[PDB]
Amino acid sequence: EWLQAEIARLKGKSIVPLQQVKTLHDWLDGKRKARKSCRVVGESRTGKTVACDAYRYRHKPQQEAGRPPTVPVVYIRPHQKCGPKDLFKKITEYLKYRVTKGTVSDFRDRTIEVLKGCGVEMLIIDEADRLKPETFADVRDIAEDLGIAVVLVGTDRLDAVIKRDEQVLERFRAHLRFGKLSGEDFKNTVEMWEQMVLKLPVSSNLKSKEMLRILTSATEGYIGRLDEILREAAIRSLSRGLKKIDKAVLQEVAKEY
Amino acid sequence: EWLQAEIARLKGKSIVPLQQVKTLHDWLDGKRKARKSCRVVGESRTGKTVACDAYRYRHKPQQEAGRPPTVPVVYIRPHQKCGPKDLFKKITEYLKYRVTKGTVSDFRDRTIEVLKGCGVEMLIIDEADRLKPETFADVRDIAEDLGIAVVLVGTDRLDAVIKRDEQVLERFRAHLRFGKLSGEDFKNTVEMWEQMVLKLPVSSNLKSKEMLRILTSATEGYIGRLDEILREAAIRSLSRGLKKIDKAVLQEVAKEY
Amino acid sequence: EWLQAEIARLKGKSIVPLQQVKTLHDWLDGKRKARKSCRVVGESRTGKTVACDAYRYRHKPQQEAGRPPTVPVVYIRPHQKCGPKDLFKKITEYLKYRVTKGTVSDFRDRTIEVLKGCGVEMLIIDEADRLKPETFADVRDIAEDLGIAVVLVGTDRLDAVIKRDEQVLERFRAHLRFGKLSGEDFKNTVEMWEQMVLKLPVSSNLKSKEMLRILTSATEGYIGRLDEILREAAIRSLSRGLKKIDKAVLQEVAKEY
Amino acid sequence: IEAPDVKPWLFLIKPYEGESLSHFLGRFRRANHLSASGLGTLAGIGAIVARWERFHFNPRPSQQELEAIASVVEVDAQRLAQMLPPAGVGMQHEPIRLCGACYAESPCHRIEWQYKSVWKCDRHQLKILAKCPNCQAPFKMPALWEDGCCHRCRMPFAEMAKLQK
Amino acid sequence: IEVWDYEQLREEYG
Amino acid sequence: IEVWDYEQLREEYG
Ligand SMILES: Nc1ncnc2c1ncn2[C@@H]1O[C@H](COP(=O)(O)OP(=O)(O)OP(=O)(O)O)[C@@H](O)[C@H]1O
Ligand SMILES: Nc1ncnc2c1ncn2[C@@H]1O[C@H](COP(=O)(O)OP(=O)(O)OP(=O)(O)O)[C@@H](O)[C@H]1O
Ligand SMILES: Nc1ncnc2c1ncn2[C@@H]1O[C@H](COP(=O)(O)OP(=O)(O)OP(=O)(O)O)[C@@H](O)[C@H]1O
Ligand SMILES: [Mg+2]
Ligand SMILES: [Mg+2]
């Protein structure tokens, strides 16, 4: 069924090279060669996790016939109230080697062995504020011991955690911030999203003045909402046999937000 | 004894289709296919928990002789001050999976393995505000990691808890609200309850103006009160050898509330 | 429907260049470069708040790829019995940072960090007399510590509050005063409003003596009343199929004030 | 209350022909995420099962731990019995021998390789490894194998089969 | 002279 | 411009 094929697509995910994303990739590269640690901050729906993920994938791990994989970038995400053991365990799994059973000092010794030899240039920690305050001792330790850049990614709260300790604030003083959509940038996005993500047969033509008012109020500049809203509108719309997104169905969706 | 058979019936429980209930079932279905998380809000006697049951039962789990089941909908209720360990344990038990002692990270790894493979599309969490603030990290994690819609069900306080954290507010921004009975809807309900639930040989003829006044003042539109009150009135009334509900016996019951 | 288009227009809001407004814009600019604090005073319907917005909008925030917006002018309006945390909270939100849980010293230290880096030259506080007496300590502190001009806007009551404290009166001693319309200025305004705001086909000749008497008594020179009255008069008048404002219909409206 | 018309269950695996016991139990523990003590606990047979993973079998508790455990792994006592050397024969211990040539067919370990008399594979016709050819380390119990990867010297394990014979 | 719509100034804001 | 599917990157992963 043609309709079923299309609904499954719309329910999925994709990466669109937005203006905000291009900047981060170049900034991190600077930091990568310079081998310096830094942090990235911004509001929770700005798409920080995605920009950082897209980056990870542009540097495929490499493999020769003999030695272990060389893995320039490591991306991990902690659990809530992450302890010192939990951080090493995830780094070790990420790199495909598993050590089971021992004490904290053993996970640490083993983490430094897999981080060495195997080239690692950058470690990215998502939701950095899930880290328990003491774990930063182990994050600094690695950052200073090995020539590995460490990047901390998070919301404004992350800085509230960092500013409570001078030892950390100073290693991670440099920062980049993500912002929101506005003005001409919000409009250009909307148009890209229509052609690049929705793809209905009949042009729904949203950049029109009358329609942008609806979207602006509904989304308030967060790329997160903009995506959810236009996808929910094409899916609802197709389920009812329409060939485009109109004004009333868009309002029907926006009303629920 | 004929009379005893009848008292036992009245003492029990049943589900009556109502408009409130139908609305939810269709709304959730939208959300299920779209795979989007949401919340349901409303006052505590509107019958939210019961609508959720009625929903669960419309999708029979399937099972083959050897491999694991397919369970499209999972419904759980937390205990007060629910922690991260308590949530995983209840998810794992609801599927009749055998498990014992281990640490929090171990229940977490297990929760993702039983949620995977086993078709699960939606998770519904009742009494949602019993969750401790940190557990929401685990609720978001699942919602983002697995294509599972999470529905939070609760009273106005639920939103007071949610607004304390921007990370949660945004995943669960869309909502549906349950309301109270009024006007013609309260009147039609009362009538349904007489024909579909009470069933006395003597015919009550409740919808009468002078009787609805009694019930309206007594119940203030809550379906909860309406049910308890008419059932307490038929049981008391039968025990006294009457064949119908009159005005005085109804007032005798309502006076106690 | 032609008439409906017109009613919606009249129902709305606009800003008309006027002498009072231009005067302020130039005065503030002097103060902005000089970096000096001051206050703006005048009666409650002179249109102080509007001139201030008209000013804000002529200086749009600027944005680079990485760092926070550069924001030359910050405009805030306090709630009633505004405390020290309420002032910092609004300054911080205005610049689009999220405020999290902490104590008074934290809001203060954080406010000074976002006021730095982000170029800020002027802070405008509307309805200044909603401030609790102690908060003025924080308003002076900023004005003296950072090269930021602070402007206090308000009615004659503001000065009655300010004279209760020498320390404040003296930092904010310079002022500009808004007045009322009269003579040729009231007459020219009326005419501007007719050609620039009302635009009925007929041309109602308000500047005629017979109409100015009605408006003068009705408005007493406040730009606020003049606008409300002529808009209520053109809207009522159109609904009745007339294309100009006559004597009786204007008196019908004026009598209600 | 919990969902209707279901029974208690866990994740099952299928044995391969010739598969060894230590190996089998390891797959099982991994599929279901648990400790050996854990298996012993669901089972109610004590801590005794952990040394099975490193091939120590003083007994054949054929009607005790072994008849009983079938109910957890869903494999019958006899198929399970077959995962150990017949009473009186076989019984090798320290080196763990392997023929990587068969790994192209199925990752596994074949228990026959640990009977005392073996040094060659007849099915693939060749010298059996008793030690790693590159890093020259001995191998870890079949029971603890991960993804067919060598920690000492990562390779495809299967990729090693062109060499040594 | 130019006169501005009040909601337009809002829409064009930074 | 190139745009990527989200799961594709995983299918082509190192
Ligand atoms: N380049 C992009 N293309 C399409 N969608 C994007 C893009 N960037 C972000 N998104 C949207 O953001 C969502 C992914 O999460 P997001 O990028 O907000 O991570 P995040 O901002 O780090 O979240 P949080 O900070 O709350 O953990 C997706 O639902 C997607 O619609
Ligand atoms: N569809 C229905 N059919 C029959 N009875 C119903 C129905 N919906 C609600 N009720 C009545 O409501 C009661 C169930 O509790 P109800 O859902 O009203 O409160 P609740 O929302 O579960 O409370 P809380 O949200 O505080 O847990 C039952 O006793 C039943 O008589
Ligand atoms: N330049 C202008 N263009 C159009 N309308 C104006 C203008 N100036 C003032 N007004 C009218 O006056 C009103 C704005 O009042 P405003 O709040 O700016 O004065 P205020 O003295 O600050 O009032 P308050 O002291 O109560 O805050 C509007 O409703 C508007 O109709
Ligand atoms: Mg994220
Ligand atoms: Mg309930």
Author numbering:
A (entry chain H), B (entry chain G), C (entry chain B): 19 to 275
D (entry chain X): 2 to 166
E (entry chain b), F (entry chain h): 570 to 583
Sentences from the paper on this structure:
CRISPR-associated transposons (CAST) are programmable mobile genetic elements that insert large DNA cargos using an RNA-guided mechanism. These components are thought to cooperatively integrate DNA via formation of a multisubunit transposition integration complex (transpososome). Here we reconstituted the approximately 1 MDa type V-K CAST transpososome from Scytonema hofmannii (ShCAST) and determined its structure using single-particle cryo-electon microscopy.
TnsC has dedicated interaction interfaces with TniQ and TnsB. Full-length TnsB has a 52-residue-long flexible linker (residues 518–569), that connects the STC to the C-terminal ‘hook’ (TnsBhook, residues 570–584). TnsBhook serves as the point of contact with the TnsC filament body and is critically important for CAST transposition. Furthermore, because these interactions are not observed in the TniQ–TnsC structure, this is not solely owing to the binding of TniQ, but must be related to R-loop formation, consistent with other reports.
